[PDB]
Design a protein around this ligand. Structure first.
Ligand SMILES: [Zn+2]
Length: 276
């Protein structure tokens, strides 16, 4: 299963060269970005910290299918189309397979931390948030990626007109609007948001939302991201309380596992991998 998704990921057009230096056959995956790098560039990404890039060997390490949602939907070509859109013209800034560590470090820092080569699309804040909102509603992963390239705050409230509760973020919206074909939209937000605990005007966190609709797959992504299970909504309920009350067994079992400090390592989720 995971092996079949990995071979698919490796065969994606553009995934045959390291995202950052061109080295052939990259095998290191940045799970929150859906891209593949050579081992050398991989070493620099590790230094950036999990708030920027979470590395794992695609062919050597054991992975939960949930960690391949982004790899399956993004890929080097698509990612670089946005992140290297403004790479210098007559100034060969991008490292090549023979480049030293100092050179990869300077480029990788500028590319990912500074976003020096990304296409800055939107005319700031207001626009950025609106595009993020639309990207989620249309389930467009590259639209989410662009918002992230523009440096949008993924945890900020979005200009949503008919939200379920006031002050929803893109994560609240994503959780209640994605399905088996679009879990990766929720995943992108979970792996690139520093705070998965934002609350609606009624104190609801994305976890609460998951329990209200018995969305166990989104719930699994959130727990993997260590969203806090003890935050209560304005009525005093925690997500576990909601799950019990509505009798949503799967959600109850998952939250109870987490509550007892025994939650899953390699998190698998039901998704339309389309590997037939
Ligand atoms: Zn490389």
């Amino acid at each position: 299963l995971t092996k079949e998704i990995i071979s698919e990921v490796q065969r994606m057009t553009g995934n045959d060269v390291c995202c950052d230096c061109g080295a052939p056959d990259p095998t290191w995956l940045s799970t929150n970005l859906g891209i593949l790098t050579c081992i050398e560039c991989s070493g620099i990404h590790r230094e950036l910290g999990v708030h920027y890039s979470r590395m794992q060997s695609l062919t050597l390490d054991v992975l939960g299918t949930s960690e391949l949602l982004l790899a399956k939907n993004i890929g080097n070509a698509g990612f670089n189309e946005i992140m290297e859109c403004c790479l210098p013209s007559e100034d060969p800034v991008k490292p090549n397979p023979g480049s030293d560590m100092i050179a990869r470090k300077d480029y990788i820092t500028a590319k990912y931390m500074e976003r020096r080569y990304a296409r800055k699309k939107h005319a700031d804040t207001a626009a950025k948030l609106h595009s993020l909102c639309e990207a989620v509603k249309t389930r467009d992963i590259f639209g989410l990626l662009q918002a992230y390239a523009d440096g949008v705050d993924l945890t900020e409230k979005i200009p949503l007109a008919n939200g379920h509760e006031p002050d929803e973020t893109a994560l609240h919206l994503a959780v209640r609007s994605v399905d088996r074909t679009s879990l990766h939209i929720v995943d992108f937000l979970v792996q690139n948001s520093g705070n998965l605990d934002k609350q609606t005007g009624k104190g609801s966190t994305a976890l609460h939302y998951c329990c209200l609709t018995d969305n166990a797959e989104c719930l699994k992504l959130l727990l993997r991201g260590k969203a806090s299970i003890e935050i209560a909504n304005e009525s005093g309920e925690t997500p576990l309380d909601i799950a019990k009350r509505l009798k949503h067994e799967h959600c109850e079992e998952l939250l109870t596992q987490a509550l007892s400090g025994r939650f899953n390592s390699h998190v698998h989720v039901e998704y339309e991998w389309r590997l037939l």
